[PDB]
């Protein structure tokens, strides 16, 4: 077919261009940097109270309150500075797997196996949690949603499609389609104009919120994409796939930057996040352990061996003060 | 010495902890089941019967709550979800049991059903979940066997060299061929279950029909046995 031949020719041209540009591995140039010291993170205050697995969590702007979603159907706000719980929002659907904190903290969005996204306000005058808005229209389960504005929300569903919704009208402002596999993780750039979405097709696609179309694509992972994070500079991102390897890509170079893998790891990267500087990459693994890798040398900076079950979520504070990681053991641990 | 705001925060945290403990006890009191099956398995009929005997087109989960012998059961059915089930299935790694309904009368699709059952059994996160295999739609299977218009050997050649077990007691009112075919299918499923399951993974094979009104009894007995097994370990009996 003419279309198939044209697609094959374009793919071959792209591969040839990448090979020509990628003359040698990037590790050779970066090796000039001195090795980083041993960053032995230690737990400070373990969090208890959840009755089921923790699947999502996000740090707020104040870097004091963090939302957490548990499969029992509960959203709990945990105070890092005190450990006291501020809000506990039961959900009509038990299998909630996504949750996020708005930049201003006025609204919190969540989703589960149901194709309806529920948004609640934590600053109600009465003081009782209520369903502020219910976004409906998705065909698949909500995988992950990240806030970029108090008026509009970007979410990714299991139907291999991402949708931008306007909280005011409550309708799909625009939809992003093209993924062959289910979208798993999402991440927004600092300008909140471009975002990268990973799926089960082992490919990551970069889209523009205003353009409403696919901008770039990034193959290179061997397996399903489980996590995606943006480098603080905003021009690079890091992904964690089921192949037990992490890859860093540049939106401008359109080529792999660094690869993190080892022979002793045969499990997948459930969570991936970057620090404020981006030098240290933190990844959660199914072996009940968390690993810290050097973004420039891929060296094992430290291993967090304290966890009783699989490590579902991981994130760093906006200021980088501490790292909170959630696991299937219904416990969240803060490390510094 | 602590500020009033701090004290109010501690009191609110204590209240939230008490509410969470009450929710925990309520959650533990009830049992949660996952219902799965093929298109022809007849999940809709079973769930409607359960709802009416033991009491938004984009909805992806249908939860039916029924009570047997004062024991609350919450059965979840997957609705508007893509056929790719490798991802969302992991969320059900804490269910007490999975009731998988298989149409034994659909020979062409019995092997796809067997493959799906094998994949569920061998999943890393589902190895701790017992499976209640319900071979539904036995009336059609019996009618086909009596008519003889369809031969199981076309899809399962081992049926030709299969003999009815002597230890098992066939139903007096059932044709020997029907019993032999049902026992062959059950044997296939049991071998699949036992090939890699032991100590913490059990499969319960039973014969049921969509018109049967005693399925809830079998489910309740299965759950009782599963909780017995779990308590044997949780109470240090081993």
């Amino acid at each position, epitope marked *: 077919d003419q279309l198939r031949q044209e697609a094959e020719q374009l793919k071959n041209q792209i591969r040839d261009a990448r090979k020509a540009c990628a003359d040698a591995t990037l590790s050779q140039i970066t090796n000039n940097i001195d090795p980083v010291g041993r960053i032995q993170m230690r737990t400070r205050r373990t969090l208890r109270g959840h009755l089921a697995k923790i699947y999502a969590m996000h740090w707020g702007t104040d870097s004091r309150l963090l939302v957490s979603a548990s499969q029992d159907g509960k959203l709990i706000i945990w105070d890092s500075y005190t450990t006291n719980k501020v809000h506990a929002i039961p959900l009509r659907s038990s299998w909630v797997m996504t949750c996020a904190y708005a930049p201003s903290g006025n609204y919190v969005a969540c989703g589960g196996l149901d194709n309806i996204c529920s948004i609640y306000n934590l600053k109600t005058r009465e003081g009782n949690v209520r369903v502020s808005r219910e976004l409906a229209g998705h065909t698949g389960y909500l995988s992950c949603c990240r806030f970029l504005d108090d008026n509009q929300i970007v979410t990714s569903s299991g139907d291999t499609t991402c949708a931008l919704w306007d909280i005011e009208t409550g309708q799909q402002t625009t939809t992003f389609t093209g993924h062959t596999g289910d979208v798993m993780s999402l991440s927004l750039a600092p300008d909140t104009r471009l975002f990268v979405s990973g799926a*089960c097709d082992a490919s990551a696609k970069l889209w523009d919120v205003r353009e409403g179309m696919c901008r770039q694509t990034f193959t290179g992972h061997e397996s*399903d994409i489980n996590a995606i994070c943006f480098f603080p500079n905003g021009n690079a991102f890091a992904t964690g796939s089921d192949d037990a390897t992490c890859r860093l890509f540049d939106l401008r170079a359109d080529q792999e930057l660094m690869t993190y893998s080892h022979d002793n790891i*045969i499990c997948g990267i459930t969570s991936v996040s970057f620090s404020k500087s981006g030098r240290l990459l933190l990844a959660g693994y199914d072996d009940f352990n968390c690993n810290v890798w050097d973004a420039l040398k891929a060296d094992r900076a430290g291993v967090l061996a304290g966890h009783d079950n699989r490590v579902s979520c991981l994130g760093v504070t906006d200021d980088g003060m501490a790292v909170a990681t959630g696991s299937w053991d219904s416990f969240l641990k803060i490390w510094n | 010495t602590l500020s009033a705001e701090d004290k109010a925060a501690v009191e609110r945290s204590k209240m939230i902890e008490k509410q969470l403990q009450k929710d925990k006890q309520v959650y533990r009191r009830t049992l949660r089941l996952l219902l799965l099956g093929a298109d022809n398995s007849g999940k809709s009929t079973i769930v409607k019967q359960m709802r009416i005997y033991h009491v938004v087109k984009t909805s992806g989960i249908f939860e039916t709550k029924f009570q047997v012998d004062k024991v609350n059961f919450h059965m979840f059915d997957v609705g508007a979800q893509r056929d790719e089930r490798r991802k969302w299935i992991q969320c059900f790694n804490d269910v007490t049991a999975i009731i998988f309904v298989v149409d034994s009368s659909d020979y062409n699709r019995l092997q*796809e059903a067997l493959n799906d059952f094998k994949s569920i*059994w061998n999943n890393r996160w589902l190895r701790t979940i017992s499976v209640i295999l319900f071979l539904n739609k036995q009336d059609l299977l019996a009618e086909k066997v009596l008519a003889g218009k369809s031969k199981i050997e076309d*899809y*399962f050649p081992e049926f030709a060299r299969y003999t009815t077990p002597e230890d098992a007691t066939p139903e007096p009112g059932e044709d020997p061929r029907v019993t032999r075919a049902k026992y062959f299918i059950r044997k296939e499923f049991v071998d699949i279950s036992t090939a890699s399951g032991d100590g913490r993974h059990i499969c319960y094979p039973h014969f049921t029909c969509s018109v049967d009104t005693e399925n809830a009894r079998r489910i309740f007995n299965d759950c009782k046995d599963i909780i017995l097994q779990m308590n044997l370990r949780e109470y240090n009996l081993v």
Partner: nanobody, 126 residues
């Protein structure tokens, strides 16, 4: 890029034999369970056979159990499937499916034309 190219097949009279070669590139062949599936015209996909990562365990569907043979070579990362005594009912498009994750014996490579680790198929007609 995860590329899984299938080669071989064609028109063969009844009672003949065929061998379909499946070539992999971009991933470690030895770390993944390989599956062979078929989709007859006007019908859904049907699973044919699979081979474990090391090749020590092999399974076949009852339709062609003991007739077709599946073998894998890790030196060239290629997978062969030899078919014998073809019949008209075997006319279908055969796909080389990979398992979604490594180090696991459970695979879901029978998805209805949305799987990512399945190739573009070979049309075998009789």
């Amino acid at each position: 890029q995860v590329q899984l190219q299938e080669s071989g097949g064609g028109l063969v009279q009844p009672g003949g034999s065929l061998r379909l070669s499946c070539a992999a590139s971009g991933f470690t062949f030895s770390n993944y369970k390989m599956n062979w599936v078929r989709q007859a015209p006007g019908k859904g996909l049907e699973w044919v056979s699979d081979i474990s990562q090391s090749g020590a365990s092999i399974s076949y569907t009852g339709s062609v159990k003991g007739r077709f043979t599946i073998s894998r070579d890790n030196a060239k990362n290629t997978l062969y499937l030899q078919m014998n005594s073809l019949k008209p009912e075997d006319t279908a498009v055969y796909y080389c499916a990979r398992c979604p994750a490594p180090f696991t014996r459970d695979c879901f490579d029978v998805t209805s034309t949305t799987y990512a680790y399945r190739g573009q198929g070979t049309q075998v007609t009789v």
